């Protein structure tokens, strides 16, 4: 008919004849095509899908059911392809499955559907619902998996991976992550993992970390990655600061003589997700007092207005032992070197001696005692190997290991589920704060609101960081009934008012 | 009758119908008098009630004050105000709802305004996000009140903003200055909207506390702030080696 109209009629009526033919050939038979649409999508016949897409572009209202069928099929395919996975490669396999589904339904949406943008939005919405598949009465398992995938990729692993391979796989990760709708939890998980990798030196290359921070920056703006960028920059300028400190101690009039190789890794405490969890006081050992005092002097005379907090929660130092014929050197946590300098006074010690020498609390002391006891670097002389009120134990002369640099530090990664739920609780607390703020700013703007209108407005405004489910908004509203400005109206139960 | 009220304030509960029946029996007796139908109620169960509940809450506040700190005090007091509102509608006439609560406030938060305002500075400095909310409510319905917290928080944001400007590094002072103010403004517009709420007395207490920060010059000097915002505004527009796109600039 296109040939016929172009060979007889005037050119100005090409559109009207073709549209009218489609207004009777396809639009009148819309019900039959829409009935077979779901079956055609489910079998995924590419030629029939293309022909159906053309014939429903012809009809004014035939397209949206095709869109809905494609979205439902893609959501079903993704949810079947990602739910059942092994528990040892779940972080890699989840992103791999979501990326595979996305690649298949970008190819099959760009080669037989002309890359129609409504269908791409349907794909985006379907995989958005796929990735955040919350188990009923359970928290979402997406952002933990994505953060663990990035920590697995970026850390210096013994599997061996090409740097450019890491680059393109992280680009694919960004394509997966662009729809996760829980970016706050992912942000803080990745902040903690980035902190651990940066501090412990487990990053494979700082350039890869910079690339990852940049990719998240184009993914979610600059305020999403401001803290991460500050972390990376304050880890990168650590070398310059340490060289400046060495130039300072060179320029001192008297001989400084620290005696210890010193690199300090100062971190911006206003942006690093580290915490001063060991609030119990710790005592710096004797020979390290000169180093701490000299670094404070450097940081106060060459630089101004900032107070250090020697957190000691994750410090390391290489103690050399020279009683068994100088056998080995052990890199330990600073509490472990504290108890080792306690051992330096005499072979046998006591519990109260350990508190009057190191001032630490009982939990960290128990942890270090267990760490040294499992290594058997220091044997325990009492009957029971647990925490003891006296804790009378001497040096272990039976230590006959083989590695010249064996450590009593195995907390390189850890990340216990207690820590994961603690970070989840902290993110939920910040979500409560932000959600209360959004609720009350909307209310103060309106001063009278229906309940559902307030829910919709809050979900719309707080969309910039996540999509809070109605449970959180109801919890925040019930909190704001007690605290501060909101009250149930007397006219109805869904007429919240500003007080 | 007042002993039944005091028994209710002690923790137990008398007959809800009988107590309200006889208090509402001081109205409904003078119902037919045209001028001042509540005149009998205003002189037999208003002055003997407000004086008694004023006396009862004059010493109950002193019991709680001397038995707990300021943090627990505002939990009990705001608990009592919520509780006394229920015990006012359960028994009394609806025309005396405001007077009992106002009498409860004026002897539980207005008699101890000297104590509360001495703890106003310590709560904001530690940035407690809970007691600072409870202090706002107890200092909301009382006129002598909140303008001390207005000046206290204005003396705290400016104190936090000052530490975001002084001792700031010259290496990247354009970006680091504007971010630090935005970090201070960003945190303290959410905290003033959640622990406190949107209150033009308090929102202006941020601006007055921040205009003394984005204009803070050391004595006898040119104000460094306008060029610090000018240099920063140039770096975003000027072609930088970082190569940030238009999306991260706009």
């Amino acid at each position: 008919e296109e040939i016929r109209c172009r060979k007889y009629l005037h050119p100005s009526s090409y559109t009207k004849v073709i549209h009218e033919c489609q207004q009777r050939m396809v639009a009148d038979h819309l019900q039959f095509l829409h009935a077979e649409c779901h079956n055609i999508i489910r079998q995924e016949k590419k030629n029939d899908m293309a022909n159906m897409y053309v014939l429903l572009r012809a009809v004014s209202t035939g397209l949206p059911h095709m869109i809905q069928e494609l979205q439902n099929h893609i959501h079903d395919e993704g949810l079947r392809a990602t739910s059942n996975l092994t528990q040892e490669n779940m972080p890699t396999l989840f992103v791999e499955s979501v990326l595979e589904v996305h690649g298949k339904f970008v190819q099959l949406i760009n080669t037989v559907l002309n890359g129609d943008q409504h269908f791409m939005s349907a794909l985006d919405k379907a995989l958005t619902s796929v990735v955040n598949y919350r188990e009923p009465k359970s928290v979402c398992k997406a952002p933990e998996l994505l953060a663990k995938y990035c920590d697995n990729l970026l850390k210096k692993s013994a599997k061996g991976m090409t740097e450019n391979e890491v680059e393109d796989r992280l680009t694919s990760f960004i394509t997966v992550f662009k729809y996760i709708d829980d970016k706050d939890v992912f942000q803080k998980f990745y902040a903690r993992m980035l902190a651990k990798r940066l501090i412990h030196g487990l990053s494979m290359s700082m350039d890869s970390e910079e690339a990852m921070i940049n990719k998240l920056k184009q993914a979610c703006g600059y305020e999403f990655t401001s803290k991460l960028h500050r972390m990376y920059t304050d880890m990168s300028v650590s070398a310059d600061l340490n060289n400046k400190f060495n130039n300072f101690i060179k320029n001192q009039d008297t001989v400084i003589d620290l005696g210890i190789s010193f690199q300090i890794y100062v971190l911006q405490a206003g942006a690093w997700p580290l915490t001063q969890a060991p609030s119990s006081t710790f005592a710096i050992p004797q020979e390290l007092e000169k180093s701490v005092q000299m670094f404070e002097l450097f940081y106060s005379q060459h630089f101004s207005g900032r107070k250090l907090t020697w957190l000691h929660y994750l410090c390391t130092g290489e103690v050399k032992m020279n009683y068994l014929g100088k056998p080995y050197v052990a890199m330990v946590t600073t509490y472990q070197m504290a108890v080792l300098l306690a051992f330096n006074n005499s072979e046998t010690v006591s519990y109260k001696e350990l508190q009057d020498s190191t001032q630490m609390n009982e939990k960290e002391l128990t942890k270090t005692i267990k760490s040294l006891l499992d290594v058997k670097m220091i044997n325990h002389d009492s009957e029971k190997e647990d925490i003891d009120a006296e804790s009378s134990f001497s040096l272990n002369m039976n230590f006959s290991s083989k590695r010249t640099k064996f450590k009593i530090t195995t907390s390189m990664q850890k990340d216990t589920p207690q820590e994961m739920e603690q970070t989840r609780s902290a993110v939920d607390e910040d979500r409560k704060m932000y959600l209360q703020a959004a609720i009350v700013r909307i209310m103060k703007a309106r001063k009278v609101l229906r309940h559902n209108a307030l829910i919709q407005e809050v979900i719309s405004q707080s969309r910039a960081r996540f999509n809070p489910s109605i449970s959180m908004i109801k919890k925040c509203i019930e909190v704001l009934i007690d605290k501060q400005y909101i009250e149930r109206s007397q006219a109805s139960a869904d007429e919240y008012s500003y007080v | 009758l007042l002993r039944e009220i005091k028994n209710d304030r002690g923790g137990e509960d008398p007959n809800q119908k009988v107590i309200h029946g006889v208090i509402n029996s001081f109205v409904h007796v003078e119902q037919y008098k045209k001028k001042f139908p509540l005149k009998f109620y205003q002189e037999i169960f208003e002055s003997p009630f407000l004086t008694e509940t004023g006396e009862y809450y004059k010493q109950e506040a002193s019991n709680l004050l001397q038995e707990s700190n300021c943090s627990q005090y505002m939990e009990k007091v705001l608990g009592r105000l919520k509780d006394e509102e229920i015990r006012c509608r359960k028994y009394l006439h609806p025309s005396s709802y405001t007077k009992v609560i106002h009498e409860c406030q004026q002897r539980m938060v207005a008699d101890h305004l000297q104590f509360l305002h001495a703890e106003c500075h310590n709560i904001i400095r530690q940035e407690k996000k809970n007691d600072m909310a409870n202090m706002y409510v107890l200092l909301r319905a009382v006129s002598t009140g909140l303008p001390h917290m207005i000046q206290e928080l204005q003396n705290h944001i400016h104190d936090e903003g000052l530490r975001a400007t002084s001792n700031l590094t010259q290496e990247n002072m354009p970006t680091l200055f504007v971010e630090s103010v935005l970090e201070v403004h960003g945190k303290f517009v959410q905290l003033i909207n959640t622990v406190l709420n949107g209150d033009q007395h308090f929102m202006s207490a941020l601006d007055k506390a921040l205009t003394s920060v984005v204009n803070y010059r050391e004595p006898k000097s040119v104000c460094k702030a306008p060029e610090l915002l000018a240099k920063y505004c140039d770096n975003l527009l000027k072609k930088s080696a970082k190569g940030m796109t238009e999306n991260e600039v706009e």
Binding site: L267, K307, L308, C315, K320 | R163
Partner: peptide, 18 residues
């Protein structure tokens, strides 16, 4: 006898109280 070397200490800085 115990002696230490290579202290890879970590510290946090924050704006001073004043």
């Amino acid at each position: 006898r115990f002696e230490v070397k290579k202290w890879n200490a970590v510290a946090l800085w924050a704006w001073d109280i004043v």
